[PDB]
Amino acid sequence: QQFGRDIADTTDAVRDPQTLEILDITPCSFGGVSVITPGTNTSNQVAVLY
Amino acid sequence: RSPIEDLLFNKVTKGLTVLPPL
């Protein structure tokens, strides 16, 4: 075996081409961001939520 | 939670994500 595929059919665990050591693949921060703010007539303060 | 609600809870088992309910 060289590399495996998850349920999404993507490379999630690949070994080195020569070394027997195996490294898992986990994506880093890629999620969405939302902004919570009141109406513009009241104020302009905003909140950052992930 | 009542034991009935416990029984009902125990009897139920890449871009897309699941937002938790309010």
Curated annotation (Swiss-Prot), chain B:
Q: Where is this site: Cleavage?
A: R1, S2
**Reported function:** Subunit of the fusion protein that is processed upon entry into the host cell. Mediates fusion of the virion and cellular membranes by functioning as a class I viral fusion protein. Contains a viral fusion peptide that is unmasked after S2 cleavage. This cleavage can occur at the cell membrane by host TMPRSS2 or during endocytosis by host CSTL. In either case, this triggers an extensive and irreversible conformational change that leads to fusion of the viral envelope with the cellular cytoplasmic membrane, releasing viral genomic RNA into the host cell cytoplasm.
Q: What is this protein called?
A: Spike protein S2'
**Boundaries of the shown chain within the full protein:** 815 to 864 of 1273
